[PDB]
Amino acid sequence: AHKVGLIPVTLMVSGAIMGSGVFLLPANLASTGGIAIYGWLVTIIGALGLSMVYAKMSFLDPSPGGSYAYARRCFGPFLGYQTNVLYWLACWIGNIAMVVIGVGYLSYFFPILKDPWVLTITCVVVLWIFVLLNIVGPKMITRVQAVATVLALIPIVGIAVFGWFWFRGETYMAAIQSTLNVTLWSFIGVESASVAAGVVKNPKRNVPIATIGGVLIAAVCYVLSTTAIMGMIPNAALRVSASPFGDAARMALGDTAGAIVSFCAAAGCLGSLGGWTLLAGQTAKAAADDGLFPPIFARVNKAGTPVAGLIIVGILMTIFQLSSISPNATKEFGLVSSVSVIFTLVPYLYTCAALLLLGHGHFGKARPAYLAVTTIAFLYCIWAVVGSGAKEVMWSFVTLMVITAMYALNYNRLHKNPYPLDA
Amino acid sequence: AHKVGLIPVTLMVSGAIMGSGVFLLPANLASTGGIAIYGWLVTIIGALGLSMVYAKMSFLDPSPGGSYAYARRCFGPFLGYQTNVLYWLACWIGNIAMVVIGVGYLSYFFPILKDPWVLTITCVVVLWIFVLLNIVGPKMITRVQAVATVLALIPIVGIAVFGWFWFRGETYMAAIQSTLNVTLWSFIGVESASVAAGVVKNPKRNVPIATIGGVLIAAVCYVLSTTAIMGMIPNAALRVSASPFGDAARMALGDTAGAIVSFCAAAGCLGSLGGWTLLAGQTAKAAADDGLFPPIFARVNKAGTPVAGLIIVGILMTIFQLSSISPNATKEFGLVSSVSVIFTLVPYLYTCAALLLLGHGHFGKARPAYLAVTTIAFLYCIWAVVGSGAKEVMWSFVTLMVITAMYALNYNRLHKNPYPLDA
Ligand SMILES: CCCCCCCCCO[C@@H]1O[C@H](CO)[C@@H](O)[C@H](O)[C@H]1O
Ligand SMILES: CCCCCCCCCO[C@@H]1O[C@H](CO)[C@@H](O)[C@H](O)[C@H]1O
Ligand SMILES: NC(=[NH2+])NCCC[C@H](N)C(=O)O
Ligand SMILES: NC(=[NH2+])NCCC[C@H](N)C(=O)O
Known part of the structure; x- marks a missing residue:
């Protein structure tokens, strides 16, 4: 019925950022090398900065769930609404990639996991197992993520x-x-603790520490494994x-x-999606509570877990x-990974924008x-968009419009404009 | 020192929507035909709807300059800020295409206008002539636009x-x-009167009438010339x-x-940019007045014309x-026309979104x-984005981020958040 402790939270952040990336990135990166490493360097630096931003911002405001809350304070309910719809979508859509991957790893042990049917079936089953685990609770999901990342x-x-x-x-x-694509993907997760603040005991101290701790660990492992590979394969x-x-x-x-590898890979991939299911539930809950999503999302149980x-x-x-748009259908990870990244x-x-408009003065x-x-x-956010696919950047740009129009239609009475009319 | 009258305003709207489009669209459209006509039909319907929206919204609120004002009331200063930066950029950037085109038309008469040098030089000169005309005033610019469209x-x-x-x-x-590309472009201008409301005498009656009048005239001419061509060339x-x-x-x-044609074409193209220069000045002024752009933009003279x-x-x-990014350099109209359309x-x-969040109740x-x-x-706005280029939709998506970050940096103290912190 209660919250989660530093170590477990900070391991969750470390694991939000790894799971898939640790094994995908270093391979990939070493393989192609050269220009690619600079890109990698750039995004590392950008992620470190973004992490300081989140650390400081969750400090200022230990609200759930992360950027949703900050955007709501900073700009309107509308930017709040939109930030959540985007982030919420990103969390669960990204899971579609991770299940296929992390279950792929276990195909090493269970050859049958390579018949598309068994793969698909096994995938849905694992998705629901992690839904269940989340329903058991944040403590259960976090403990599992912890063992998984280590x-x-x-x-x-x-x-x-x-x-x-x-x-x-x-x-x-x-x-x-x-x-x-892989390098941008591999550093999403920076924001996790900040979003999952509502479910971490002592947010104001624990969360900023957790995010920097987590990013730091993740930063370290990425750099070490990467340089190691570049140095040891000719x-x-x-x-x-x-x-x-x-x-x-x-x-x-x-x-x-x-x-060993196709076990710890699988381990990090699944149970990382345990954490992303969690995070999805947290934004939606955070928002529904303020009346910026449907209320079923705010509907919690004893421990305050949004089971529905x-x-x-x-x-x-x-x-x-x-x-048909799934990796099980297309055998492709670009669409799902791309929208997942851009929506973040x-x-x-x-x-x-929030840190400045909210925390000037506190500087x-x-x-x-x-x-x-x-x-x-x-500049990193811009960098990532520019380095993403044009098709997918356009699909996200359209989604912005759909979200706008959808807020207009779904909130027209009861909105409360900043500068209203009369009569 | 004063404002403009219905007939002239309504001809301005008609001319915002034509100038280039009337001669570009029907040709083009007949030429390719078939699937293209449906697209045309769709965007006609969408523009007619959008026009009813603007008509009604300027009615509710006869504020300058158009969507900027509505977005500011509806959402924050930030959405106000952003709407203007986008629309402002679109107005003048689009002019870069129109000068090259409308001066091209006169190459019929003055062969020399086809040496790139003379073309470029003549272009800058005409740009400034219309700047001057605007400095003379809205009445002068409007009268010229009027004679030009007719x-x-x-x-x-x-x-x-x-x-x-x-x-x-x-x-x-x-x-x-x-x-x-051409068909989407050809129907931009719907919003013009609404944006130029600050400079039209009796906005509340005159503007809604003007926009529907203008769209109606423009709608009629597009359909008539188009069907005519399809029917008479085998x-x-x-x-x-x-x-x-x-x-x-x-x-x-x-x-x-x-x-006759390469004269009235030229006529409609130039002096239409007289109106777009005007409109650019109006958004910027509207916004600077509220302290959402630099103040030099709000700096007016006797008649209240933002000369600087x-x-x-x-x-x-x-x-x-x-x-080098100019049509004079690239001999291409896609980049300029595309960003011009998407920024609108x-x-x-x-x-x-504004009409609903503001004018519910008044329904x-x-x-x-x-x-x-x-x-x-x-659905038309979405349609237009989806039918635009992916590169250019991405460049607009990046611009959104640059605008966001730039507001954050340039307004951080003095912003006034909807839900502030403490200490
Ligand atoms: C409720 C959990 C199980 C429900 C779904 C059962 C598995 C359905 C079959 O999977 C799909 O079959 C297609 C037909 O061959 C393949 O083309 C594709 O690769 C694969 O994705
Ligand atoms: C202040 C008004 C006049 C200033 C600019 C003078 C004209 C400059 C020449 O134009 C450009 O010259 C390039 C070199 O050949 C061409 O490649 C290109 O097509 C053309 O765009
Ligand atoms: N469902 C998601 N949004 N997952 C994001 C995963 C990103 C993370 N950096 C990783 O490599 O795993
Ligand atoms: N500078 C601009 N934004 N021009 C827009 C022009 C669009 C208009 N429909 C035309 O055909 O001329």
Whole structure:
């Protein structure tokens, strides 16, 4: 019936940011290399800045759930409304990618998991298992995310520690498109604790610490595993198709790296979606409470868990999953990953705008930065949009319009304009 | 020192919507035909609806300048800020296309106007001439726009009246991309009177009448000239390259149609940009007055004309014109026309949202529509975005972020949040 403690929360943030990314990014990145690494560097810096922004903002205002709340204070109910619809959509839509991936990893052990049918079925089942777990509660979901991420660090920490022996000279000059997709994706999760603040005991101290702790851990692992791989698989080796990560895996860990890796990968991927289901429920609840989403989303139980909220998300998730637009259908991760990333960027951007419009004054002698630090978060949000696909940036731009019109229609009486008419 | 009268205003709206479009659209449209006509039909219907929306909204609130004001009341200063930055940008950027076009038309008479140098030079000069005219005033700019559009109707009205004799059977089944560009472009201008309300005597009566009058006239001419051409140039004739409009022109008007047409075309194109320079100055002034743009834009003279405002716009226009991104450089109208159109759509969309959030109550027994009529305006805005280019929709999406961040940075103290902090 109560909230969650620092360590578990901070591991949740670390895990929001990893799960899929840790194993996808370093492989991918080493593989293509060169121009790609700069991109990676840029987005690392941007994520670190954005994290300071969130840290500071959740500090100022320990409200649930993250950017939704900040955008509502900062601008209107309308920007609140919109921020949540976007972020909410992003959380669960992204799950459609992660189930297919994290269950793919276990195909190593259960060959049958590669018949599309079994894959799809097994996928829906796992989605609902994590819905159930969330219904059990934040404590249950968080404990599982915790064990899951640490498990996923075994292989990352391992390759790092034993890649030092094989560490050498670095070919840094040497497709860039889709790596950019993966790299942008791999650093979403910065905002998680801030969004899940309503469900963390002592938000004001715990959340800012948690987000920086989490980002810091995640930043460290990404850089270490990445440099490690670039250093230990040769430049002429880069070529070897289907190689990349797995190569470093076996050479640094034995001929059981297969099992260990495709286990901790799966571990980090699933149970990370446990956390994203959670987060989806939290924005929606946060918003429904203010009357900026339908009220069923605000409907909680004893512990204050939006069970109907989470159940719905389970339903939507499985409709989408069984749809033709799903990775199970298309065998493609670009659409889902892309909208998932871009729908997060608007919340990011409003959060930055929020820090300044809300927390000027609370800056004092340390003002620029913040100013500096946050125009960096701004430039990263822009960077990410510009580096995303045009089709998908357009689909998000359309979604903005649909959301606008939909608020107009669904809230027309009872809105309360900032500068009303008369008569 | 004073304002403008119905007839002139309503001709301005008619001319905002034509100038370039009347001669570009019907040609183009007949040429490609088929699927293209449906697109045309859709956008006609959407523009008619959007016009009812603007008519009703300027009625409710006869404020300057249009959607900027409505968005400010409806949502925050921030949505006000953004609506204006977008619409303001659109007005003058679009001018870069129109000068090159409308001066092109006079190349018929002055062959030299086809050396790129002379073309460019002549272009900047004409831009400034219309800046001057605006500085003389709204009355001067409007009178010129008036004579200009009526002149441009001579050829349209003519082809219509004498295309009835040649009217026959219609091949309606038969690239679609760029026609869609032209058709979307050709119906921008609906919002003009509403934006130029601050400078029209008796806004509340005059403006709603003006916008419907203007749209109505424009709607009529587009449909008449278009059906006329489709009916009088044969299906096998459709092919004939460089033909299209000119064919119908000569066959319905003599072997001087060349002069008459490339004169009234030029007429409608230039002096339409007189009106767009005006409109640019009006949004900026409207906004600067509320402290949502720099104050120089609010700086008026005796008659209350933002001379520095308009001069600046002249400067920006000529920087852009002499830039590599200009039609003088690229020989292409897609970029400029596209951003010009998409930057208008967000103002449209917020205006629709505004009508409902502001004017519920003032609907009474006639409520749905409005509801109906305005979800149509909504669907048209979405339609236009979706039918635009992905690159350019993305550039507009980025611009949104730049505008957001820029408001954050430039207004952080003094903003006044809807739900502030403490301490
Ligand atoms: C309620 C949980 C189970 C409901 C769904 C049962 C599995 C449906 C089959 O899956 C799909 O079958 C298509 C037909 O071959 C494949 O083309 C596709 O790859 C695969 O995605
Ligand atoms: C202040 C008004 C006049 C200032 C600008 C003078 C004209 C500059 C030349 O124009 C440009 O010259 C380029 C070089 O050839 C061409 O490639 C291009 O097509 C054309 O756009
Ligand atoms: N459902 C989601 N929105 N997931 C986002 C995942 C992003 C994260 N950086 C990862 O690699 O896993
Ligand atoms: N500068 C501008 N924004 N011009 C818009 C022009 C659109 C109008 N429908 C036309 O055909 O001329």
